[PDB]
Each structure stands twice: as structure tokens, then as C-alpha cells.
Design a protein around this ligand. Sequence first.
Ligand SMILES: O=S1(=O)NCc2cccc(-c3ccc(-c4ccccc4F)cc3)c2O1
Ligand SMILES: [Cl-]
Ligand code: NA
Lengths: 261, 262
Amino acid sequence: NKTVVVTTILESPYVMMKKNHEMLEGNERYEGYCVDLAAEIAKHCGFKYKLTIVGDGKYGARDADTKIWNGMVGELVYGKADIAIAPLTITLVREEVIDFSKPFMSLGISIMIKKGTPIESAEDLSKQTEIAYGTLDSGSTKEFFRRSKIAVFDKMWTYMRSAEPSVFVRTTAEGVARVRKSKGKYAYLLESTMNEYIEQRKPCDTMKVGGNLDSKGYGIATPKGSSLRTPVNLAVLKLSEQGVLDKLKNKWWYDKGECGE
Amino acid sequence: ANKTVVVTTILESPYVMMKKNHEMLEGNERYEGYCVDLAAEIAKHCGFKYKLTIVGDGKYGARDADTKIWNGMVGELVYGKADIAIAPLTITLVREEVIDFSKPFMSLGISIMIKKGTPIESAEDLSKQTEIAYGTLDSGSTKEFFRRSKIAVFDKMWTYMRSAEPSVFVRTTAEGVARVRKSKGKYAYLLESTMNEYIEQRKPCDTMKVGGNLDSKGYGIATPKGSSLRTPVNLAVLKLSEQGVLDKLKNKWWYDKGECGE
Ligand SMILES: O=S1(=O)NCc2cccc(-c3ccc(-c4ccccc4F)cc3)c2O1
Ligand SMILES: [Cl-]
Ligand code: NA
């Protein structure tokens, strides 16, 4: 049998470098929710696997120029990896070129502010210019705003796409650092899962405000034609019904709390 | 060629309800609700014509233990009586082994309905007392959750529910709602958060959802294995999700209609 190549991304608390990782080897370098999830899926499906961090550090978008997929989606589409086990958002355009399991986690786009910022809704953001705001590159959130027809959401896209300097960031960690460093002049649009994790991490200076802007899920992704597609989907549902997904969430979000795409 | 698609669904408010003047009407026009509109939207993005049919046993779907025959909407798909189910039908592992589901169009979890003022705030609360009975719907995903759970609190509940006399189980959501309302706080109903939240905004506004949700999952649109409709419908659901149409329909049928304003 073949060792299954799992593309994933460095995103806390889903995948994280262990403390002394530089002397560690292979899968053992990494910890977190998706690292556990991978082990769970692989157990129930009976395969050996190798975690590989996505080379370009992106979730995945299709270049408008060349129509070439980057990120984790690209690794699957071009035969570089066999499965993606990541906080990878189920979308129509992605479903057109890869397969997704039933979701293992729900999320929605959300607003992160530095505590005390005078904002509580997307509409609030759209109606001012003092406080800048942006999203991750090459993910589902930027794409949600590029395509939304909803007034406020289209208004925000028109601002973000032309703002100088760039309001987009390469990594979620860069987005939070900006909110943290901007003395309240940068708000960050990100998935509620990541917002809710950051909110329980020192220095406890960020906050989720307002309700989510949309409703969707993360799913384990496979190349078209993969023999793994069905075994993995049934694995996800079994882990859901066994409470394991709830246990993993509590382990990596709240067991880990410090402040009580 | 093109043949009319048979839709199996279930009279479950606000998903499929009889229109006020239903006796004057024929076919699809007799019905209204979240899933009536959803069926309309799916049919239009997939380009098929369809008949809404109400599941004859009024059940969601489970496999009998002696015969191993599926009842409910699941049975209608499995045994070839319907072409698609467009209903609040919970995606589960046992059902995914015999039918296909689209990606979810709606999120939900098991929850607790109480008569206002009942001294219960959680599932643990229910499990640690005997004065207040509690139950679930038959032939649905919530009963099976308790039957199979290995979590101590939920198993304790099943062990009680399964042997209680008289029966704590109901044949329809309506009959659980009624039992809560007429038992003076001595009955609590376990039901999906979506339906709990809907009932909470309906007169006489004497029920409340309490405690967190006990699990997390979704409803999908289901098709029999081999169905030509599987991929078009799956993509239609995602288009409708991203267009915000699924959000628009939830509001239409839950909150814009608030009377307190499986
Ligand atoms: O049972 S699932 O099919 N499998 C297990 C599971 C576990 C946790 C969450 C879900 C889950 C459920 C639903 C939604 C969802 C809701 C609205 C629009 C689009 C969506 F996608 C997302 C996620 C979930 O869905
Ligand atoms: Cl390395
Ligand atoms: Na659980």
C-alpha cells in the first residue's frame, strides 16, 4: 500500500510546530486539532500517512491571470498530495475541482477588533474610514467579499481591494499581529473558529464582535477519482457521532484557553 | 428524457406546512414552508419539475430491528418510491450507508425544551432527577443518539427513557410540544435546536430552549444511490448557501414570523 500524502497548513490550533521540533522528525514535528484528526481518519481508514506543510502557505485560490490553483487546493488538483486535512472551507468553486467530506466543523466569517475599538458590525466597518480592515490572501474569506452582492459586503470589498498600503495579509498570524499593533486602527475579517481561539490567548487584547456574516463548514478534501473519498466521509461522520470531534475542539480551544479558509 | 421528480418530505413546521386555503388547492400549491421554498430553488438551479409528496407513515427514517426494513422518508428513497427528500433530514452515518446527502443546508444540535419555569437548565440536570420525565421523537436521529451514546450522562438518560412507563417517546414533534405544554413542567422534550427555536417564538410562548446543544450536525438533501440528481443538487445547495439564500429563508420562516415578538 502507498503512504498517503496529507497536505496541511500551519494554522493555530489546527497544526502547530511542537516545542523542540527542530530535532523531531516526520509527523512527530506537529501537534494540534488536524494532527489529531489525521490520526483519527487514518485509523478508521487503515492507511499510513505523511503530514506535509503546503509549500506556499496558502489555503488555495485560482489565479485570475493563469487560472492555476495555488495552496492546498493546488497540491490536490495537480497530484502533489492525496488528501488535505486542514481548516479548509467547503465552497462551490472548490467542490467543482476537488471532493470534500461532510463537514467536521462549522464556522462563519467574523470580525476581530482590538479591545475598545468602536465597531460592532460589518455595517459599522462599511460606514467609516478611520479604521482599516482586511482579510487573508488566497482564501475563502477574501473570495466571499470579492463576490458578495450584499450591499455592506460589496461596499467593504470596494474599499479593501483598492486600499493603500495593502490591507490583505499572508497568514492569520500576521492579521492578528496587525490588529494588535494598530492601536485600534485595524480590524481583521477571519473565520470565527480562529477568532474564538485567538480570543483566549494572551495578551487577551482582541475580541470577536457582532454575529457571523455567513455559515459554512470545513471538510476533508480529496482529488477527483480518489479511492479515499468514501472511507474518509464515513470516518468523519463516525467521529462526529462518537463525540470525538467535540472532544478535539474542547482540547485545542478551551483546554488551551488562557484568558478565562 | 425528462420525468417529473418525486419529492418526499414531511409536515413539520416551519419546513412543510398546509397552506391556509389548502382545501382549495392541488399539488405543490397546498404547501408552504422553508423546504417548500428550498425545493423550488433547487429545482430551478437543477432544471427539473417535481411533485411534493408527504411521507405516508409521517416518519423521518429508521431501520426496524426484527425485519431490518427502513421506514420513513429514508425508506421511500431506499425502496425507490421517491426520487429525492427535501426535508429537515439529519445527515447520519447509518443513513449515509444507504442514501446520499448533499452538503448541509442547515446546522443543528439536540436540545432541551421545557415549559417555562421548569427547574432544569441542562442534560445533566435531567439525568440527576426523577420528578420530570423526558423523551424524544420515534424513528429519528435524536432517539438513536441516546441509544448509541457512550457518554455517561447521555447513556444514563437512554437507560431511563428506554424503560420509562408510560412511554416518553412521541410519534411527532407536535405531540412532544403538546406533552411539554400540558404536563405542568413534569415533561421535558429532547428535539433538534432548529425546531425548539421555532416553537419558542410561537404562541402561547410557554416553552423555552435551555442549556447548550448536545451535539452538532446538519440537514442535507438526500437522493437514492445512483441518482442522476446527486451532483447537481449538491452544487445547488452550495450556490444557495453562498448566495445568502439559505440565510434569507431561515429568517423568513423562523423570525420574521415570530409571534412572541431528525
Ligand atoms: O453533520 S455534518 O454533515 N457532519 C458533521 C458536522 C460536524 C460539525 C458541524 C457540521 C455542520 C453542519 C452544517 C453546516 C452548515 C450550515 C449552513 C450552511 C452550510 C453548512 F455547511 C456546517 C457544518 C457538521 O455537518
Ligand atoms: Cl521542518
Ligand atoms: Na458530544
